[PDB]
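During the second year of the project, the team shifted from modelling isolated chains to modelling whole assemblies. The rationale, set out in the original proposal, was that interfaces cannot be judged from single-chain predictions alone. As a representative example for this report, we include one of the complexes processed in the last quarter. Its constituent sequences, exactly as entered into the pipeline, are reproduced here:
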Amino acid sequence: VVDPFSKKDWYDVKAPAMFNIRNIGKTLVTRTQGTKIASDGLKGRVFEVSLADLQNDEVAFRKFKLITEDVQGKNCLTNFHGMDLTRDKMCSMVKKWQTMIEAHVDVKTTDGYLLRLFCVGFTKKRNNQIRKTSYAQHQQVRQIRKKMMEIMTREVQTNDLKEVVNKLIPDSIGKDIEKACQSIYPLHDVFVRKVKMLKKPKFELGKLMELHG
Amino acid sequence: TKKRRNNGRAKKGRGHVQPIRCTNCARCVPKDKAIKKFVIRNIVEAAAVRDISEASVFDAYVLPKLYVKLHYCVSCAIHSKVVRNRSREARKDRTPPPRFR
Amino acid sequence: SLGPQVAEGENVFGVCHIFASFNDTFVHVTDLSGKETICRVTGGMKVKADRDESSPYAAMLAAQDVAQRCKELGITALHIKLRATGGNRTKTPGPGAQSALRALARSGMKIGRIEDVTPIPSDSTRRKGGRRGRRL
Amino acid sequence: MRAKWRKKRMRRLKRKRRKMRQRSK
Amino acid sequence: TSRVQPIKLARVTKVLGRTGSQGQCTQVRVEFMDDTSRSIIRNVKGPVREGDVLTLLESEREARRLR
RNA sequence: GCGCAAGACGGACCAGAGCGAAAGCAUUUGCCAAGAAUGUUUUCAUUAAUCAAGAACGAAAGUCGGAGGUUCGAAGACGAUCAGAUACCGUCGUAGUUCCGACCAUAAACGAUGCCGACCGGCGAUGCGGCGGCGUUAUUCCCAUGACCCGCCGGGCAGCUUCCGGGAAACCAAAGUCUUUGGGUUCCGGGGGGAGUAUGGUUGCAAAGCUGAAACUUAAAGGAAUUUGGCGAAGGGCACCACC
RNA sequence: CCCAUGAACGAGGAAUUCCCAGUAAGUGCGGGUCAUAAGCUUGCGUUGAUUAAGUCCCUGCCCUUUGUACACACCGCCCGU
RNA sequence: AGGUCUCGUAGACCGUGCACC
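Output from the structure prediction step:
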């Protein structure tokens, strides 16, 4: 009988201080109908955003996942939860007559954040190469994979979340990947394919306070 | 008699290959015998891309594509006119036809 | 019911999921989080014919209905979550999805990102049917 | 008629004959 | 639709083959005088020579086959 | 949309590529063990690819005792279709499909072509290992390295061409070196059925595998290939007695 | 031939035929039929257009390739109770 | 100082079926 949108509130999300655009969208939730709290319903909400709509003008095909866990009124405070890539880009990366290389490490930061860094690797045909095949040996792939193991062990363990998030915005890790493995096999298309959250520590408000500055 | 040099497949020094289910059909055709289709297509068709372009918030927004691989049984390939039949000396031709459109 | 922002310069953003099989089409619109929906119209809403639940005519009728729904709600910007049936079966989208989004854009609506969100498996179980296929 | 079904019917009549002979003795 | 778009008029360059179920409509390459560089392929019904000009209502859609 | 739990499988990368005696083998990492080929001015010195007796391995399905039973799915149930379906089709759906051990040893297990050795054309690529030789790159100088290029060697999966030669022809670098017949060595077939049938032996819990006739009937059964013929096969041309 | 008699019929459903220039169509005039003789046919003449310089969609015909266990040739051969 | 750079043409799909003989 009654319209369900009459008792509907409206809320706004806030990007963290690491990004250039603080406001990216809005959401809507019902009222506090008895024991059910509207602030609780914003806790289990995942806002799936793009990086080009989050910073100014850059590489556009990167993808972010955000989680909201702190509301007080007419505002929603977000946090980094995971990084992905578009299906079209990764489908464009896979091609025949080249070798695909996968490497994942379960790593920990200085705080209690358990990460999982998926990366892909695709070989580069030389400009003067006459061979159409352009493959690599298995032990070369194992050496490149072990190089990826020690690189993602080195760059995440010694430092906190904010600096590796700020390193994730450009292709710093990726350029380090071409710079490290140029001697083994020249490969040109490398990306961090997926970042998956594994374990969260005990939640506190203060780290969310200087999360947004 | 023997029709082809091979047997409609690419099994030379294996003796056994993994079968993969068809798309239109559900046959358990092997990998080397089945005809594989890798089509390059946009999200939408060609007579609406401009109508998308004035309806976009962004400026000069590039239309994404779809990258799928189709696995065809030979009966589904001949039924959908993907591959046709040739003559005796016309079957002695490995190269694909030229892609003009 | 409405939004606190002025509707002169800026806009609001939500996502719409377009599921398109060979037997039905779906126009499901949620918020940016995707947890809270606003409306859902299918090809069986508008056509009283069992064979035409997945057709561009039902797609454009549902697109006009959901355009009226989002216009009276005030939603101005949409992100497309296009998907086929997924699973272990075929992955090509239905023909009603393109016509549905075209008729949605024809109603003066603004769209943003376009992406495909179909459930592509690594390697799923055995497909329904027999070893000799779905022959007829 | 292929050899598979004549093989199957020979198998069936052979097995009914031999089960009749084993229960007869 | 529901957009007041102005009428653009076009001039012929080359006649091509004719499509259709019965073979009645002709594919023609044709181009505008206000922007000379951009040219479009359109579906036109009727006998068309070279040297004339054509009146056009929409500059948005693309020509295609018999269906 | 957010999580949990269980089972199955490792797509795209994935090729007329690799390995293995064959069945067969694809997420990363670690452990153990074996092997081809390459190189050798290393060792032994005829120690041999040949094999009835005998022995190991062996697709799927089938049987036996255990927890798991996601998906799919023989029999079965239901609804359409059809003159008539307990067939094609759709929804459920038992046993199985999954693991450990105990079995059986059957496939179009097919390169429908046994094993070793020697000889007889060329060409362009592929994989491994070795070798020589301009140049570029891990930024600018010097060396080895990986990547690329140009050549050679041996082994392997393979391709194109032919009056070498052969065959009934399809076709063959072997299916050649065969009346101008003889390199060595296992298994196996004398028209077609009857018939891989009956009996006997054999092994198997069972399902059943191996060995394996006779009577009687038949003048054909068959292999390659050419021309109208017929497709509920594809492609193209023509027609105001077809169309717009 | 003359005078009376004045019905249906308000541009016809499904379906279907003919036609590219002096052509269709509207007219009239000859020949055959003929003792009496044209609502038929074959020609002649007047006036005289709309649309198109193509297609294989429909309807048929023809050709190439492919498969054949068919040769009296699919109205064929051929399996089992 | 000019204001519409020059030259040639496929840039084709994108609703479509099919029981029972």
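Residues 13-14, 16-17, 19, 27, 29, 33-37, 39-41, 62-65, 67 of chain E lie near RNA strand H (CB under 10 Å from a C1'). Chain E touches chain B at residues 60-62, 64 (CB under 8 Å).
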